[PDB]
């Protein structure tokens, strides 16, 4: 029968020492760890879990060496407490920086934020999945220990009068709570309701980490560089288990008896498609990934259909206009160095961007899986034709409008000039036109052309300086843009030019804009904020979010009506065309080519 051992983290090392013998100090054979802190485990799985406070990630590996996976890589700021729900097979964690308690599957999937309101600085975290309750300590404001159901609901404050508590442990069998008090230098205990409180040991120079096993409590002490042990009720029989161990971060006893109990999730995941979250009354509630919604069946989840995307130098973020005002999530996308522009294909659900470092057009799914480079040349802005499956983009080095198929196959250039310096671009494949910006020497223009480069016309001469971004709404029939030097956002009609200056007031440098549903969102780089304007019966200028550092682009996504999509002529096998597909006039199809080829007699091929 496998015996119990004690896990501890210190610097880059996670080590096991055998209890009942107090030796065999071996390290778990882990690679790539810089600074380990929070520890937990899964006995049935024989897996270990840890936090890296330096790299700001959460990882797992089999005890036996490895099947090492990074389980949470993005969105952590000051990750603190971390714990395994061994029944629902979910991973919980708390973050002091972002002020959120988050959950996900043990393999990192279906990440969801459980509590984010009224949280100051969440620290220690402890789970009771048998009873469906979670417990945490908060360090900000008036320090306290809280309780809530393991879905974030039914939140109460359990211990209102404590110092900064750090070692929060449940003794599952005897129904008690234990924590270290850093301010009062003592170990305290209470029952599950935070009553019948008692101090266990008070002569403590610097207590930090804490665990409970059988009759014993275990703690680490940074002042006397030790892992110490005592009787859980009297506090007597004090012994030094390990000395000369400075800065031991977390300790835990690994044993089957520490993960006992049962709930309704332990059997086939409560039939929930994604997350099964334990609840004190009604056993369980099916949960969903962030931004996703629970269906009528109280079982399956639906992905958000209408949302907003905004990018900065190192991250693409997604936001939704929620009833509960859900927080933004940082999309888990690898190798982002300097994002300059973004777009999104609503047909295959893929995110496209351009990295100005390594100068490439890259694409991935929202979960960060389908990673693929489309264009490998100094791209500036891009715009997707969702019907022809082409991406139109502008090159800064060659000053050209280039069109590439989504799978990376080249279609060709459609516009090049000796004087032309094309920059911002947005396509309108519904009317068969593209719109763009021309940053020519001393003389800038907002232009319009056919998707092939014909029917060119200058829409605006004066009132421009350095227009930087474009947007359009095919429903209403308007074109939007933002001027960087003049700090103003203007609006006009598609074919016509009904120039309105809707905002010109409190702006520093706008760098992006899009239309959501009936709102005009934009992004200010210096002011570091997102703002929106109402298009209909005005609700007035509204602040969306501030404190966003180095933001580059903003993009709106809408639910794609599959019935309305297949009715568009150019989506029906590109209208027969080998290259460019055009719609104009009576709403029929006409083929065209890039600049190195000509249309060939059958008016179909190049
Ligand atoms: C238009 O885009 C294509 C890629 O979609 C560019 O073609 C590449 O050009 C480089 C030369 O600089 C070659 O090494 C690659 O093999 C080409 N890729 C292909 C053919 O898929 C092309 O340069 C762009 N056009 C202009 C005028 O810049
Ligand atoms: C590691 O552990 C797993 C499960 O216990 C096992 O399947 C695998 O063979 C082990 N690998 C070793 C011992 O190299
Ligand atoms: C711990 O102390 C309690 C209370 O004095 C006692 O009942 C128990 O036997 C002790 N257990 C030990 C020393 O393992
Ligand atoms: C779950 O859906 C059922 C319909 O099957 C509905 O009656 C019920 O209100 C839902 N559950 C809860 C807890 O609201």
XYZ file of C-alpha atoms and ligand atoms in Angstrom:
676
model
C 0.000 0.000 0.000
C 1.691 3.225 -1.205
C 2.795 5.367 1.729
C 2.373 9.113 2.282
C 5.031 11.645 1.322
C 5.554 15.390 1.650
C 5.935 17.698 -1.342
C 7.665 21.077 -1.107
C 8.637 23.833 -3.514
C 11.763 25.976 -3.185
C 13.451 28.020 -5.937
C 13.338 25.951 -9.147
C 12.763 22.678 -7.311
C 9.838 20.503 -6.216
C 10.978 17.776 -3.863
C 9.421 14.827 -2.061
C 10.506 13.672 1.372
C 9.131 10.440 2.791
C 7.052 10.872 5.963
C 7.247 8.188 8.702
C 10.962 7.880 7.748
C 11.837 11.592 7.234
C 14.417 11.107 4.473
C 14.647 10.088 0.790
C 14.744 13.746 -0.266
C 14.378 13.342 -4.045
C 13.375 15.973 -6.578
C 10.477 15.435 -8.941
C 12.405 15.290 -12.277
C 11.050 18.521 -13.783
C 12.619 20.634 -16.521
C 12.098 24.293 -17.441
C 10.888 25.368 -13.991
C 12.325 28.667 -12.729
C 10.402 29.446 -9.531
C 7.828 26.993 -8.161
C 5.206 28.054 -5.612
C 1.643 26.676 -5.235
C 1.426 22.869 -5.250
C -1.380 20.328 -5.613
C -1.894 16.791 -6.957
C -4.154 14.080 -8.395
C -3.619 10.644 -6.773
C -5.739 8.590 -9.172
C -3.963 10.217 -12.116
C -0.581 10.183 -10.290
C -0.036 13.729 -11.563
C 1.488 16.786 -9.897
C 0.436 20.403 -10.367
C 2.351 23.602 -9.688
C 2.473 27.346 -10.211
C 5.518 29.250 -11.441
C 5.432 32.734 -9.841
C 8.293 33.849 -12.108
C 7.117 32.650 -15.542
C 3.518 33.217 -14.381
C 2.184 29.863 -15.628
C 0.540 26.742 -14.224
C 1.903 23.352 -15.220
C 1.373 19.645 -14.657
C 3.400 16.463 -15.076
C 3.186 12.813 -14.061
C 5.010 12.122 -10.797
C 7.276 9.632 -12.608
C 9.221 12.269 -14.434
C 7.028 13.626 -17.152
C 4.212 14.182 -19.519
C 4.933 17.838 -18.867
C 2.233 20.216 -20.049
C 1.776 23.904 -19.579
C -1.825 24.037 -18.496
C -2.354 27.808 -18.096
C 0.108 30.052 -19.996
C -1.674 33.372 -20.528
C -3.593 35.921 -18.510
C -1.829 35.476 -15.178
C -0.446 38.505 -13.327
C 0.093 37.631 -9.674
C -1.107 34.012 -9.561
C -1.405 32.859 -5.954
C -3.431 29.955 -4.593
C -4.108 26.992 -6.834
C -6.015 23.746 -6.169
C -7.180 20.543 -7.855
C -10.841 19.503 -7.826
C -10.184 15.745 -7.901
C -13.858 14.816 -8.378
C -15.042 17.152 -11.133
C -11.563 17.013 -12.700
C -11.236 20.819 -12.757
C -8.341 23.127 -11.880
C -9.004 26.212 -9.726
C -6.709 29.212 -9.182
C -6.657 32.742 -7.745
C -4.858 35.847 -9.025
C -3.945 38.877 -6.875
C -3.078 41.054 -9.900
C -6.169 40.493 -12.063
C -8.428 40.051 -8.964
C -10.188 36.942 -10.249
C -10.860 33.377 -9.188
C -10.709 31.162 -12.262
C -11.511 27.564 -13.158
C -10.708 25.200 -16.041
C -10.359 21.485 -16.769
C -7.223 19.814 -15.410
C -5.719 19.819 -18.913
C -6.296 23.588 -19.247
C -9.480 23.494 -21.369
C -12.751 25.452 -21.026
C -11.149 28.175 -18.911
C -13.787 30.246 -17.112
C -13.713 33.068 -14.571
C -15.860 32.232 -11.526
C -15.620 35.362 -9.364
C -14.323 38.820 -10.341
C -16.606 41.298 -8.538
C -15.778 42.733 -5.085
C -12.482 40.789 -4.936
C -9.494 42.650 -3.558
C -6.414 40.416 -3.362
C -7.307 36.706 -3.457
C -4.475 34.640 -1.992
C -4.819 31.121 -0.520
C -7.365 28.727 -2.025
C -8.869 25.466 -0.681
C -11.522 23.184 -2.166
C -14.173 20.962 -0.610
C -15.691 19.310 -3.716
C -17.443 16.704 -1.541
C -19.625 19.458 -0.056
C -19.373 21.772 -3.087
C -17.706 24.690 -1.326
C -14.504 26.620 -1.974
C -12.602 28.815 0.477
C -10.130 31.660 0.001
C -8.288 34.437 1.835
C -8.264 38.064 0.703
C -5.347 40.378 1.520
C -6.513 43.754 0.201
C -8.684 46.144 2.215
C -9.907 44.631 5.478
C -8.317 41.145 5.260
C -10.854 38.273 5.370
C -11.581 34.600 4.658
C -14.473 34.008 2.247
C -16.655 31.072 1.207
C -18.646 30.277 -1.932
C -20.126 27.414 -3.928
C -17.659 25.966 -6.415
C -19.413 27.781 -9.259
C -18.874 31.191 -7.652
C -22.474 31.578 -6.478
C -23.751 31.830 -2.885
C -20.814 33.933 -1.710
C -20.482 34.859 1.965
C -17.764 36.179 4.272
C -16.720 33.513 6.762
C -14.006 35.066 8.942
C -14.316 38.883 8.904
C -11.594 39.632 11.485
C -8.147 38.258 10.545
C -4.688 39.333 9.433
C -3.267 38.328 6.058
C -3.848 34.569 6.006
C -1.798 32.291 3.760
C -1.864 28.551 4.489
C -5.559 27.781 4.090
C -6.100 24.037 4.604
C -9.184 21.938 5.259
C -9.068 18.932 7.565
C -11.764 17.034 5.658
C -12.399 14.272 8.216
C -12.636 16.442 11.359
C -14.393 19.340 9.548
C -11.953 22.177 10.383
C -10.054 25.099 8.764
C -6.426 26.054 9.370
C -4.484 29.127 8.228
C -1.290 31.048 9.005
C -1.614 34.654 10.157
C 1.390 36.641 8.908
C 0.583 39.816 10.861
C -0.080 38.119 14.231
C 2.613 35.454 13.696
C 0.413 32.490 14.626
C -1.519 29.465 13.343
C -5.277 29.617 13.846
C -8.129 27.151 13.292
C -11.921 27.273 13.017
C -14.829 25.047 11.978
C -16.420 25.126 8.514
C -18.580 28.135 9.462
C -15.622 30.178 10.750
C -16.695 29.786 14.368
C -15.155 27.972 17.373
C -11.895 29.756 16.520
C -8.670 28.793 18.305
C -4.953 29.645 18.146
C -2.795 26.513 17.777
C 0.739 27.960 18.017
C 1.743 31.598 18.607
C 5.554 31.614 19.022
C 6.205 31.881 15.280
C 8.918 34.130 13.760
C 7.711 33.967 10.115
C 5.059 31.310 9.285
C 4.052 30.892 5.642
C 3.025 27.558 4.060
C 0.644 25.159 5.808
C -0.810 21.643 5.472
C -2.693 19.174 7.655
C -2.386 15.383 7.412
C -3.527 13.163 10.272
C -3.051 14.347 13.839
C -0.550 16.922 12.607
C -0.292 20.374 11.108
C 2.795 21.216 9.070
C 4.181 24.679 8.359
C 7.217 26.359 6.811
C 9.094 29.198 8.510
C 11.158 31.684 6.524
C 12.851 33.144 9.596
C 14.337 29.864 10.819
C 14.519 28.268 7.336
C 12.418 25.245 8.288
C 9.502 22.885 7.767
C 8.002 22.325 11.234
C 5.265 20.072 12.673
C 2.868 19.944 15.657
C -0.302 18.380 17.144
C -3.289 19.887 15.273
C -5.337 20.633 18.423
C -2.943 21.444 21.286
C -0.014 22.761 19.235
C 2.429 20.799 21.395
C 4.932 18.082 20.365
C 6.718 20.630 18.144
C 9.424 19.074 15.947
C 11.651 20.297 13.125
C 11.073 18.000 10.162
C 13.484 19.844 7.874
C 15.937 22.583 8.805
C 18.294 24.673 6.660
C 15.488 25.069 4.107
C 15.101 28.776 3.415
C 12.113 30.095 1.431
C 10.028 26.932 1.217
C 7.033 28.192 -0.706
C 4.290 25.578 -0.385
C 3.945 22.208 1.311
C 1.461 19.386 0.897
C 1.128 15.766 1.894
C 0.522 13.455 -1.071
C -1.790 10.573 -0.121
C -5.062 8.980 -1.233
C -6.798 9.807 2.078
C -6.402 13.546 1.432
C -8.566 13.307 -1.685
C -11.490 11.304 -0.334
C -15.216 11.852 -0.785
C -17.730 11.810 -3.610
C -20.057 14.128 -5.521
C -22.332 14.008 -8.573
C -19.528 15.103 -10.955
C -17.284 12.102 -10.210
C -19.473 9.896 -12.449
C -19.266 10.693 -16.200
C -18.746 14.418 -15.420
C -22.424 14.944 -14.462
C -23.121 14.568 -18.197
C -22.036 18.210 -18.685
C -20.405 18.743 -22.085
C -17.684 20.988 -20.642
C -17.271 21.799 -16.935
C -18.965 20.055 -14.010
C -18.964 22.355 -10.995
C -19.845 21.049 -7.528
C -22.687 22.776 -5.652
C -23.815 22.350 -2.002
C -27.535 22.153 -2.883
C -28.418 20.241 -6.064
C -25.036 18.452 -6.314
C -23.779 20.126 -9.488
C -24.257 22.802 -12.143
C -22.946 22.506 -15.694
C -20.516 25.294 -16.549
C -19.161 26.750 -19.779
C -15.910 28.371 -21.039
C -15.599 32.162 -20.715
C -18.093 34.023 -22.954
C -19.895 30.758 -23.790
C -23.536 30.217 -22.754
C -25.420 27.305 -21.165
C -28.199 25.907 -23.375
C -31.821 25.091 -22.471
C -30.870 21.485 -21.642
C -28.709 22.629 -18.669
C -25.948 20.495 -20.179
C -24.308 21.725 -23.414
C -22.593 25.045 -24.229
C -22.765 27.527 -27.120
C -19.855 29.669 -28.346
C -20.392 33.458 -28.417
C -21.614 34.428 -31.891
C -21.406 38.225 -31.628
C -18.309 39.648 -29.926
C -15.498 42.202 -30.094
C -11.767 41.728 -30.639
C -8.978 44.112 -29.653
C -5.223 43.727 -30.046
C -2.135 45.187 -28.425
C 1.599 44.610 -28.952
C 1.658 41.163 -27.295
C -1.993 40.054 -27.069
C -5.326 39.639 -28.843
C -8.227 40.133 -26.418
C -11.926 39.291 -26.804
C -14.880 41.026 -25.155
C -18.640 40.486 -25.119
C -21.539 42.803 -24.241
C -22.838 40.588 -21.449
C -25.763 40.798 -19.022
C -23.427 39.975 -16.087
C -20.705 42.136 -17.717
C -18.216 39.273 -18.194
C -14.526 40.230 -18.136
C -12.273 40.200 -21.198
C -10.144 37.150 -21.840
C -6.667 37.202 -23.324
C -6.758 34.720 -26.215
C -4.207 31.897 -25.712
C -2.175 32.560 -28.871
C 1.524 31.683 -29.064
C 4.406 33.703 -30.540
C 2.854 37.178 -30.607
C 5.652 39.749 -30.860
C 4.132 42.901 -32.389
C 0.521 42.624 -33.568
C -0.257 45.451 -36.009
C -3.687 44.510 -37.423
C -6.460 41.919 -36.938
C -9.377 40.343 -38.815
C -11.639 37.312 -38.373
C -13.209 34.705 -40.640
C -16.773 33.950 -39.404
C -17.087 30.889 -41.684
C -14.336 28.671 -40.234
C -14.017 30.671 -36.955
C -10.378 31.707 -37.457
C -8.467 34.770 -36.270
C -6.068 36.571 -38.598
C -3.402 39.115 -37.667
C -0.116 40.586 -38.846
C 3.113 40.539 -36.842
C 5.340 43.517 -37.677
C 8.277 41.594 -36.203
C 9.058 38.772 -38.652
C 6.675 40.592 -41.053
C 4.034 37.910 -41.589
C 0.292 37.285 -41.817
C -0.604 34.629 -39.256
C -3.831 32.838 -38.301
C -5.176 30.687 -35.435
C -8.365 29.504 -33.746
C -9.635 31.334 -30.627
C -8.319 28.515 -28.389
C -4.931 28.957 -30.115
C -4.902 25.597 -31.904
C -4.997 25.922 -35.712
C -1.797 28.036 -35.812
C -0.799 28.679 -39.430
C 1.149 31.362 -41.349
C -0.517 32.663 -44.530
C 2.051 35.179 -45.829
C 5.784 34.975 -45.094
C 7.164 41.879 -47.671
C 6.112 44.287 -44.912
C 2.319 44.030 -44.357
C 0.527 47.081 -42.932
C -3.217 46.306 -42.822
C -5.443 43.402 -43.915
C -9.119 42.843 -44.757
C -10.905 39.522 -45.383
C -13.272 38.743 -48.254
C -15.446 36.097 -46.572
C -17.246 35.080 -49.773
C -14.304 34.610 -52.154
C -12.112 33.416 -49.248
C -9.404 35.976 -50.026
C -7.427 38.244 -47.770
C -6.639 41.691 -49.175
C -3.583 43.390 -47.694
C -1.305 46.395 -48.146
C 2.500 46.154 -48.258
C 4.544 49.067 -46.888
C 7.789 48.166 -48.686
C 6.313 47.797 -52.185
C 3.231 50.060 -51.846
C 0.713 47.671 -53.337
C -2.655 46.024 -52.669
C -2.052 42.269 -52.665
C -4.655 39.486 -52.538
C -3.906 36.070 -51.009
C -6.115 32.974 -50.675
C -6.787 32.000 -47.035
C -4.726 28.797 -47.387
C -1.716 30.934 -48.369
C -1.868 30.427 -52.133
C -1.213 33.719 -53.951
C -3.851 35.406 -56.110
C -1.837 38.512 -57.049
C -1.602 42.294 -56.882
C -4.631 44.365 -57.897
C -3.302 47.921 -57.453
C 0.187 49.425 -57.832
C 1.409 52.956 -58.586
C 4.652 54.954 -58.598
C 3.093 57.639 -56.387
C 0.617 55.349 -54.569
C 1.225 54.541 -50.902
C -1.776 52.367 -49.859
C -2.227 51.741 -46.119
C -5.589 51.207 -44.378
C -8.021 48.919 -46.225
C -11.509 47.463 -45.803
C -13.278 45.332 -48.417
C -16.977 45.425 -49.349
C -17.569 42.213 -51.370
C -21.350 42.722 -51.085
C -21.207 45.711 -53.457
C -17.972 44.608 -55.193
C -15.818 47.517 -54.011
C -12.826 48.011 -51.715
C -12.048 51.177 -49.709
C -8.574 52.362 -48.726
C -6.172 55.058 -47.524
C -3.367 56.566 -49.626
C -0.545 58.110 -47.559
C 1.123 59.895 -50.481
C 3.872 62.507 -50.003
C 2.331 65.653 -48.444
C -1.042 64.740 -50.002
C -3.184 62.035 -48.293
C -6.435 60.592 -49.716
C -9.349 58.293 -48.843
C -9.882 56.232 -52.000
C -12.231 53.654 -53.510
C -11.709 50.977 -56.179
C -13.217 47.788 -57.581
C -11.954 44.528 -56.037
C -9.704 44.185 -59.118
C -8.251 47.730 -59.120
C -10.489 49.346 -61.746
C -13.122 52.095 -61.294
C -10.664 54.043 -59.099
C -11.916 57.305 -57.607
C -10.641 59.674 -54.921
C -13.362 60.199 -52.296
C -11.691 62.866 -50.123
C -9.017 65.512 -50.791
C -9.177 68.010 -47.914
C -9.785 67.493 -44.184
C -7.141 64.766 -43.929
C -3.600 64.592 -42.549
C -2.737 61.029 -41.522
C -5.870 58.823 -41.707
C -4.891 55.530 -40.129
C -7.873 53.142 -39.938
C -11.073 52.332 -41.835
C -14.393 50.626 -41.075
C -17.745 50.167 -42.808
C -21.336 49.029 -42.262
C -22.977 47.433 -45.312
C -26.343 47.357 -43.508
C -26.675 51.111 -42.865
C -24.521 52.118 -45.854
C -21.828 54.229 -44.186
C -18.018 54.475 -44.172
C -15.993 55.317 -41.052
C -12.378 56.413 -40.522
C -10.018 57.886 -37.914
C -7.368 60.586 -38.393
C -4.181 60.250 -36.323
C -2.754 63.788 -36.633
C -6.037 65.736 -36.516
C -7.438 63.507 -33.724
C -10.955 63.147 -35.148
C -13.399 60.486 -36.369
C -15.542 61.117 -39.444
C -18.450 59.428 -41.242
C -19.732 59.482 -44.831
C -21.921 57.520 -47.263
C -20.644 54.551 -49.334
C -20.816 55.774 -52.949
C -21.544 59.388 -51.987
C -19.720 61.718 -49.612
C -21.960 63.094 -46.870
C -19.101 64.229 -44.609
C -20.035 64.333 -40.907
C -17.505 64.902 -38.109
C -19.229 63.017 -35.278
C -16.323 63.149 -32.790
C -13.388 65.584 -32.595
C -13.239 66.510 -28.899
C -11.301 64.610 -26.206
C -8.920 62.537 -28.372
C -5.125 62.042 -28.262
C -4.353 59.489 -31.018
C -6.967 57.110 -32.470
C -5.514 54.048 -34.188
C -8.555 51.834 -34.855
C -12.342 51.609 -35.210
C -15.205 49.197 -36.040
C -18.996 48.964 -35.927
C -20.434 46.475 -33.436
C -24.227 46.307 -33.742
C -25.247 49.971 -33.727
C -22.205 51.415 -31.948
C -18.958 52.888 -33.277
C -16.061 51.624 -31.163
C -12.600 53.189 -31.374
C -9.188 52.942 -29.712
C -6.906 55.680 -28.367
C -3.245 54.713 -27.936
C -2.022 57.549 -25.688
C -5.238 57.816 -23.627
C -5.051 54.003 -23.403
C -8.804 53.438 -23.722
C -11.770 52.144 -25.732
C -14.827 54.353 -26.338
C -18.125 53.937 -28.226
C -20.760 56.126 -29.944
C -24.449 55.397 -30.582
C -25.655 55.534 -34.203
C -29.439 55.642 -33.642
C -31.249 57.654 -30.918
C -27.997 58.708 -29.256
C -27.027 57.352 -25.836
C -23.973 59.632 -25.946
C -20.214 59.077 -25.785
C -19.456 56.231 -23.367
C -16.176 54.979 -21.873
C -15.760 51.211 -22.328
C -12.408 50.477 -20.652
C -9.178 52.289 -19.733
C -5.655 51.246 -18.589
C -5.022 49.202 -21.776
C -1.338 49.724 -22.582
C -0.084 49.443 -26.186
C -3.256 48.792 -28.210
C -3.059 48.541 -32.014
C -6.368 47.459 -33.603
C -10.042 46.796 -32.867
C -12.381 44.512 -34.807
C -16.062 43.583 -34.562
C -17.490 40.126 -35.250
C -21.135 39.295 -36.008
C -23.193 36.079 -36.109
C -22.918 34.637 -39.620
C -26.312 33.756 -41.091
C -25.478 30.606 -43.095
C -28.763 30.956 -45.002
C -27.916 34.561 -45.993
C -24.309 33.593 -46.809
C -24.930 30.908 -49.468
C -27.170 33.408 -51.301
C -24.188 35.654 -52.066
C -23.171 34.932 -55.695
C -19.390 34.875 -55.140
C -19.632 32.197 -52.409
C -21.104 29.762 -54.951
C -17.705 28.357 -56.043
C -16.304 31.885 -56.575
C -18.932 32.591 -59.265
C -16.963 30.308 -61.592
C -14.034 32.769 -61.574
C -10.430 31.578 -61.379
C -9.347 34.769 -59.596
C -11.397 37.893 -58.784
C -15.181 37.616 -58.368
C -17.188 40.826 -58.743
C -20.798 41.831 -58.104
C -22.241 45.106 -59.438
C -25.456 46.687 -60.747
C -28.389 44.277 -61.007
C -26.640 41.902 -58.579
C -25.064 39.387 -60.962
C -21.482 38.089 -61.228
C -18.480 39.201 -63.335
C -14.933 37.782 -63.301
C -11.593 39.631 -63.205
C -7.837 39.200 -62.679
C -4.776 40.513 -60.810
C -2.368 42.790 -62.718
C -0.018 40.187 -64.253
C -2.887 38.340 -65.976
C -5.790 39.155 -68.320
C -9.370 37.833 -68.582
C -9.531 35.103 -71.233
C -12.419 35.102 -73.784
C -14.735 32.856 -71.717
C -14.848 35.719 -69.166
C -14.203 33.126 -66.476
C -10.465 32.345 -66.527
C -7.217 34.325 -66.339
C 1.986 39.381 -53.168
O 2.006 38.333 -52.216
C 2.765 37.189 -52.556
C 2.562 36.152 -51.454
O 1.184 35.941 -51.239
C 4.248 37.535 -52.737
O 4.893 36.467 -53.408
C 6.106 36.015 -52.766
O 7.237 36.757 -53.193
C 8.496 36.357 -52.668
C 9.575 37.251 -53.275
O 9.778 38.385 -52.462
C 8.791 34.883 -52.970
O 9.944 34.457 -52.276
C 7.621 33.982 -52.586
O 7.841 32.695 -53.121
C 6.291 34.532 -53.101
N 5.190 33.745 -52.572
C 4.340 33.041 -53.324
C 4.513 33.049 -54.818
O 3.423 32.390 -52.828
C 4.431 38.800 -53.582
O 5.729 39.307 -53.367
C 3.411 39.916 -53.325
N 3.521 40.868 -54.417
C 4.198 42.013 -54.307
C 4.245 42.895 -55.521
O 4.769 42.369 -53.277
C 4.394 7.370 -16.222
O 3.111 7.138 -15.643
C 2.058 6.651 -16.463
C 0.811 6.436 -15.600
O 1.158 6.060 -14.283
C 2.468 5.367 -17.191
O 1.480 4.998 -18.130
C 3.802 5.568 -17.910
O 4.224 4.350 -18.490
C 4.866 6.095 -16.939
N 6.118 6.338 -17.638
C 7.319 5.906 -17.236
C 7.436 5.102 -15.969
O 8.337 6.149 -17.879
C -2.655 15.495 20.409
O -3.174 16.174 21.537
C -4.502 15.831 21.885
C -5.009 16.791 22.960
O -4.113 16.835 24.049
C -4.550 14.373 22.341
O -5.878 13.974 22.607
C -3.948 13.474 21.263
O -3.795 12.170 21.778
C -2.595 13.999 20.760
N -2.173 13.233 19.601
C -0.899 12.929 19.320
C 0.205 13.389 20.246
O -0.604 12.278 18.322
C -32.952 23.780 -16.438
O -33.843 23.583 -17.520
C -35.104 23.088 -17.123
C -35.854 22.571 -18.345
O -35.449 21.244 -18.593
C -35.839 24.219 -16.407
O -37.126 23.805 -15.995
C -35.031 24.681 -15.191
O -35.541 25.921 -14.746
C -33.515 24.809 -15.440
N -32.806 24.699 -14.170
C -32.611 25.706 -13.310
C -31.857 25.368 -12.056
O -33.007 26.857 -13.491
